[PDB]
Design a protein around this nucleic acid. Structure first.
Lengths: 80, 155, 62, 206, 127, 98, 60
RNA sequence: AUGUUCAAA
RNA sequence: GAAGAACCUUACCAGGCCUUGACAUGCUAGGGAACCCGGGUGAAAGCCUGGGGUGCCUUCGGGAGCCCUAGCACAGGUGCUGCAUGGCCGUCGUCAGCUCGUGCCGUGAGGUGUUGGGUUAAGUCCCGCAACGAGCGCAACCCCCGCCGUUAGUUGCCAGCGGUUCGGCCGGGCACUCUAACGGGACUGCCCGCGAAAGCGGGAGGAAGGAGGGGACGACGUCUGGUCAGCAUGGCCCUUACGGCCUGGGCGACACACGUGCUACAAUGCCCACUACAAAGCGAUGCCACCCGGCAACGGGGAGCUAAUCGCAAAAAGGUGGGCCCAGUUCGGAUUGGGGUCUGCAACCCGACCCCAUGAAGCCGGAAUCGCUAGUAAUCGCGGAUCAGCCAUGCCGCGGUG
């Protein structure tokens, strides 16, 4: 039951940096500390590497995981 | 109470029978100061004592209290090592406090889903000489008079 | 959308965020609370009965 | 660690405030931070003058400020040249445009703050603490006062173990809410460390 | 012509105006039995009347504001007790021994810090 | 009809103040509505006595603000003469709205 | 309460949610009252001196 | 029933 | 400690970056010096950079506000030591005590006084006594609550009259409630009883008593009590860093153990509707009237307040009527799926709120253990500080029933 309102937020570090790669097709990697950003279609297919707060983990962004927020795919804590 | 001999709070008589003893019983039914619901329950009950019993409720009530007042009770006490349970009389004051308390307690120990009824039926049973209320009362006296050996520790 | 067909959906949902690296899904696997609550104490409704273990006494764990 | 400030305790009676001016909500915090800025410099400057109190009245962009001193001279200056420097250094802090009166202390020997500072200083100069104290109580007790008492913190004489020195004469009822006891505290930076100084003076009663 | 007596209880003020008449009571407009619609205690307020065989001899207009209908019932009871004296000051002799001319000073107790309710102190375990 | 509203911390610095305003204008305008009181608003500051712990130390501090009104109907030049520039207290602050 | 950490006065919040009271005398960020700009301690210290205009000791 | 030793103020 | 942890806070961790180095007063020297708008790179910080773009005073040599650079003061360190300290606080303990001066007793440590008898809440007071007095403490002097009067009436009411859209709305009126300032009131003062006295019991009047009820207030000292992380401060240590900036993470992990709490186990109950009594507070980018769109959170619009005269506000328990019919239930709400509002640059980690669905354990707690002596416990709702928002079921406070 999540909620932002009107204006799906996405930091434009990777945004305007991800679509620039949409011009030449895609690319081979990215890496942003903006785990705060929502995922938009243009991200699909791509492979953004998010920050644990220690590491840059490679996250393949597929359709099924659009609406989510990157960080939700880069675990923070280490347990068991 | 180290100093004075704490006098008893005098209660304003009943708003129907003008009987203080009744207010007392109603206060023992009350909980969270919801004195209305408390007064109601006791009156609804009095009208349940009128139906199922051709007698005046007020007299059934007083009769009850009477059979439920213990006249002897056991009070613990340390006497050379062990704690011998010394048997002794019960003040007129304490008799009431216990009688009323016991009634409400046993009453709320009954099954009938309705509060007002448990009180109604408990009171009656008490009058007849039966019921959880009179049990405790007779249990107390039994307790004393069964320890009537250490009664020379009169207290 | 009621009964079976519904439980089918819900189950279907969970299965999804569970198939994708999604965290919320891992909380289901691991069997721990999902809606970000404390798991150091009070999580019995999600963990089950306490599973007591041996411990460290003198160290005022009061 | 008990007992309240003898002043703050009596503020309702036998002791008025150091800043008596109305204000509120949006101003009060601003109009107060100022007062502290004021007092800040005065104490940093008028030390040798013998500071004792800084009343600060107000009404609107025309502040009061009535520094109380033992040596009103040192304050004023030559012909009144210093009361020019400060009084000006003042507005370079508060455009507010404010006065700067100066009352003299009738016997600095009945000013807890003074007696305190008096002792605080001696201690800094390396005088025998207990002596300085007894002396002080005497001076105070020897020039009026129905009672007095001084207290020095610890590390008396630079001793490795912090102690606490006394001295007192005549009634000094901290409990009586109506005594009129002047309280004064003085610090005392030192080669070996800080040592607080407390002065208590009792006058009349009712 | 008219008689007055205030009356305050547990933080309630009742303006009591007696007036030779039938014996009815207008509490804040509503009838005595209308404001106190269903309160086994109400009957109390007028007790100072029956005290000296009034009621069916007087009449009362009453303004009541503050507290709760229970506190008001006692303020009003005191009002009717006071006013009943400005009328005939001789009523004291019988009206007072009952204590109707007293102002029950029992008020809520301040909620002290450290405690849950002025007294109700927090509980401990293996102290 | 000049409505004056006086507020002060000292209940004397006002009764003195607002009272001057009454005797003054009482010789150049109406007769003044007398200095009417008005409820006081108190600010409580409950603070723990010492630093570090001792949750039950406390000690209360309040900053009570007092108010006064007056009200001078029938404004007549000389009124605004006896008042206009003849005040005295420092712990006071006015607001007027005729 | 390090000079360095009294960048609070810097306005420049980049976003106004990063703003924070701080004591206007000791920097005691932890329990600063608004009406005074002072922290629970200083407020108490000054109330004792009388430097808090019309701030007497409560009691009732 | 049991709960080591040791300095300064 | 925390009366407000998403970044901030923040002191920790990871990674990027800066070194005379977010704040203070200041020095020599070269230089552009107020300031305003963009771009490149970036997670942000930061770094690089384009650039509209200077008037001030002068002995005409040059000097200022402001600001960059290089070197400097030396700055900076919540880095160690609360057994080096100040300050402040907790604590025995609001307990009845702790002492001093002189005198007297004793070789002396010390004693006497402060003990004894009566009494008190009290080392309170009385009587006695080699003791006579005094200081800190008790009380008292200060604050809140208990009755009356004066002053003041835009709070208040047909109290009392005329009108009414019959709302105290209108005129009018200060009587009353009240508002806040001052004055009166209680002192065992009066009466009976005992007592040597203090005082104990009883009674009258009185709103009220025998200190009437609740605060503030903590003696000489104790604990090598607590805090160098609020601040202050001796000593030790660090100065490409044990300093500084930034982004992100952490302070919010879990097989478990404990403390303090919230909610609850149910019909003396739950739900819907109708209807009634409160106090203390807060309100300008702040409280938010009223009107509209939305089931709603909330959005749009917009009055008044700088607010006894408008708003938050509905008090809840309660009374009246209906539904439920003792069941893990119309108890209990956890938990989870979905939709959505709102604050904020931003709510994955990690906000609160709304609506639908979901609807766990729990059927009064073993040994053991805590609070409170009357308007108290118990129970019900209301406000505040902090504060964008909020994890408040906490804290401080208010009144209702009792």
């Amino acid at each position: 039951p999540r909620s932002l309102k009107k204006g799906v937020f996405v930091d434009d570090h990777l945004l305007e940096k991800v679509l620039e790669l949409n011009a030449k097709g895609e690319k081979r990697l990215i890496k942003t500390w903006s785990r705060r950003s929502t995922i938009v279609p243009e991200m699909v297919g791509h492979t953004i590497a998010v920050y644990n707060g220690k590491q840059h983990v490679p996250v393949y962004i597929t359709e099924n995981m659009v609406g989510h927020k990157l960080g939700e795919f880069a675990p923070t804590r280490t347990y068991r | 109470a180290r100093r004075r001999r704490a006098e008893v709070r005098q209660l304003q008589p009943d708003l129907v029978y003008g009987d203080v003893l009744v207010t007392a019983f109603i206060n023992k039914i009350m909980r969270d100061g919801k004195k209305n619901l408390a007064a109601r329950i006791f009156y609804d009950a009095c009208k349940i004592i009128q139906e199922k019993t051709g007698q005046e409720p007020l007299k059934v009530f007083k009769q009850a209290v009477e059979n439920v007042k213990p006249r002897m009770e056991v009070r613990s006490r340390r006497v050379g090592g062990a704690n011998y349970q010394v048997p002794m009389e019960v003040s007129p004051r304490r008799q009431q406090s216990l009688a009323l308390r016991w009634l409400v307690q046993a009453a709320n120990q009954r099954p009938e889903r309705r509060a007002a009824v448990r009180i109604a039926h408990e009171l009656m049973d008490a009058a007849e000489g039966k019921g959880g209320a009179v049990k405790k009362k007779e249990d107390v006296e039994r307790m004393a008079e069964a320890n009537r050996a250490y009664a020379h520790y009169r207290w | 959308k009621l009964e079976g067909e519904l439980r089918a959906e819900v189950a279907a949902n969970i299965k999804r965020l569970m198939d994708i690296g999604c965290y919320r899904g891992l909380r289901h696997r691991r069997g721990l609370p999902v809606r970000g609550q404390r798991t150091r104490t009070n999580a019995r409704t999600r963990k089950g009965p306490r599973k007591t273990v041996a411990g460290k006494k003198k160290a005022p764990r009061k | 660690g008990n007992k309240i400030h003898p002043i703050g305790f009596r503020l309702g009676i036998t002791r008025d405030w150091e800043s008596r001016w109305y204000a509120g909500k949006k101003q009060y915090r601003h109009l107060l931070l100022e007062d502290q800025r004021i007092r800040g410099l005065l104490e940093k400057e008028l030390y040798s003058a013998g500071l004792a109190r800084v009343d600060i009245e107000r009404a609107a962009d025309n502040v009061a400020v009535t520094v109380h001193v033992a040596k009103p001279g040192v304050v004023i200056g030559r012909g009144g040249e210093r009361i020019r420097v400060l009084r000006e250094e003042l507005a370079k802090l508060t455009g507010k445009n404010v006065a700067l009166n100066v009352q003299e202390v009738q016997n600095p020997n009945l000013s807890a703050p003074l007696v305190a500072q008096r002792v605080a200083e001696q201690i800094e100069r390396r005088f025998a603490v207990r002596r300085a104290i007894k002396q002080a109580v005497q001076r105070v007790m020897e020039s009026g006062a129905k009672g007095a008492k001084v207290i020095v913190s610890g590390r008396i004489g630079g001793a490795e173990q912090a102690r606490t020195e006394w001295a007192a004469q005549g009634r000094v009822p901290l409990h009586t809410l109506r005594a009129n006891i002047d309280y004064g505290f003085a610090l005392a930076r030192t080669t070996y460390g800080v040592l607080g100084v407390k002065a208590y003076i009792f006058l009349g009663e009712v | 012509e008219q008689y007055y007596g205030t009356g305050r209880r547990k933080e309630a003020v009742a303006r009591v105006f007696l007036r030779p008449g039938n014996g009815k009571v207008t509490v804040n407009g509503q009838d005595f039995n209308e404001y106190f619609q269903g309160l086994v205690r109400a009957v109390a307020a007028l007790e100072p009347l029956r005290a000296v065989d009034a009621l069916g001899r007087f009449d009362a207009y009453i303004t009541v504001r503050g507290g709760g209908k229970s506190g008001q019932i006692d303020a009003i009871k005191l009002g009717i007790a006071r006013a009943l004296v400005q009328y005939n000051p001789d009523y004291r002799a019988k009206l007072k021994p009952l204590g109707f001319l007293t102002r029950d000073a029992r008020v809520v107790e301040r909620k002290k810090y450290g405690k849950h309710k002025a007294r109700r102190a927090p509980q401990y375990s293996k102290r | 009809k000049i409505r004056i509203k006086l507020r002060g911390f000292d209940h004397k610095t006002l009764d003195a103040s607002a009272q001057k305003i009454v005797e003054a204008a009482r010789r150049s305008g109406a007769q003044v509505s007398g200095p009417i009181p008005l409820p006081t608003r108190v600010r409580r500051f409950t603070v723990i006595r010492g630093p570090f712990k001792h949750k039950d130390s406390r000690e209360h501090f309040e900053l009570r603000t007092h108010n006064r009104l007056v009200d001078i109907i029938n404004p007549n030049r000389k009124t605004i003469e006896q008042l206009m520039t003849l005040d005295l207290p420092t712990g006071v602050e006015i607001e007027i709205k005729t | 309460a390090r000079k360095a950490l009294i960048e609070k006065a810097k306005r420049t919040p980049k976003f106004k949610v990063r703003a924070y009271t701080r004591c206007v005398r000791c920097g005691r960020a932890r329990s600063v009252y608004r009406f005074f700009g002072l922290c629970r301690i200083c407020l108490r210290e000054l109330a004792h001196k009388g430097q808090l205009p019309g701030v007497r000791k409560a009691s009732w």
